[PDB]
Structure 1
Amino acid sequence: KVFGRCELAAAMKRHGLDNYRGYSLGNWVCAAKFESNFNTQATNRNTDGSTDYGILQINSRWWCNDGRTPGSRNLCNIPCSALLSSDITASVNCAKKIVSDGNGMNAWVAWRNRCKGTDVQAWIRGCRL
């Protein structure tokens, strides 16, 4: 499913991401925009052979099992395919684990390069939340 901006904000808010570990909702929406363009079914393969899945492009080396990433750790305890659902629950639950990890949102390269230090509140402007 491809979310609308305000639709995704609302879903993220419901699932407890607004200010999770100090990161305002705009940060999460901005990350989703540039990671996947709000498309739950996005996948991208990396040169190391791992793959990134879903709206937040969560990586198979560490976080989910795709059956083809040798020495994957599956720290979120889920098949990677679960991350492509139109229900964002699994993505959100796993993102919460990732962002608690030490590096915070710098784990998402597009957040670091495209959202960090910007007016991220613009991403929720106009929405009913």
Structure 2
Amino acid sequence: KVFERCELARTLKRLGMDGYRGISLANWMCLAKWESGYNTRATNYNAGDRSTDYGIFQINSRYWCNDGKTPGAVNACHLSCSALLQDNIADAVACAKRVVRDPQGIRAFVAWRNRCQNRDVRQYVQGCGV
């Protein structure tokens, strides 16, 4: 499913993402935008280390979810990577919350460092009623 901007913002809000571990909803929106374009079906294979990024937040199969074909997988979210390709993002959100519980927090997602950090991110939630 490809989310409309405000539809996604309200959805993340309901799922308890606003202010989770000090991360604002606008920051989460910026992350989703640049990781997948708000597309839950997005996948990206990393030929270098043989891992794959899954879903709206492009969560990696080496550390977070299990796809059974990634060398040295850890499955920290204790989830099948399949769960990260659903239209319903509850599982993706639960896993994203797990990711940011590590020391790095939101910094764990490189895309956030490149496109969101130290930038004006209000634009992502404006007009959404969140």
TM over 0.5: yes
Structure 2 distance, partners of 1:106, 1:71, is 23
SS across alignment from 1:100: coil
C-alpha distance in 2 between matches for 1:17 and 1:24 = 8
Cα offset, 1:22, TM superposition? 0.6
Displacement of 1:8:
0.4
Give the CA deviation at 1:122.
1.3
Alignment of 1:108-123 (within 5 A): 108-123=109-124
Deviation (angstroms), 1:115: 0.5
Q: State the Cα distance separating 1:107 from its structure 2 match.
A: 1.0
Q: Aligned equivalents of 1:121 and 1:128: distance in 2? A: 13
Structure 2 residue 21 is matched with structure 1 residue 7:
no
2:89 aligned residue: 88
- Report the Cα offset of residue 120 of structure 1: 1.2
Which blocks of at least 5 consecutive residues in structure 1 are unaligned? none
The count of aligned residue pairs is: 129
For 1:16, the equivalent position in structure 2 comes to 16
Measure how far apart 1:102 and its partner are. 0.8
Alignment of 1:41-60 (within 5 A): 41-46=41-46, 47-60=48-61
Partner SS state of residue 29, structure 2: helix
SS in 2 for 1:45: strand
Amino acid at match of 2:4: G
Query: CA separation in 2, counterparts of 1:76 and 1:29?
Result: 21
Q: Determine the C-alpha separation between the residues in 2 that align with 1:56 and 1:123.
A: 15
1:99 aligns with 2:100: yes
- List structure 1 runs of 4+ shifted beyond 4 angstroms: none
| 1-structure distance, mates of 2:38, 2:109 | 15
Unpaired segments ≥5 residues, structure 2? none
Q: TM-score, normalised by structure 2?
A: 0.97
Q: Residue in 1 aligned with 2:69?
A: 68
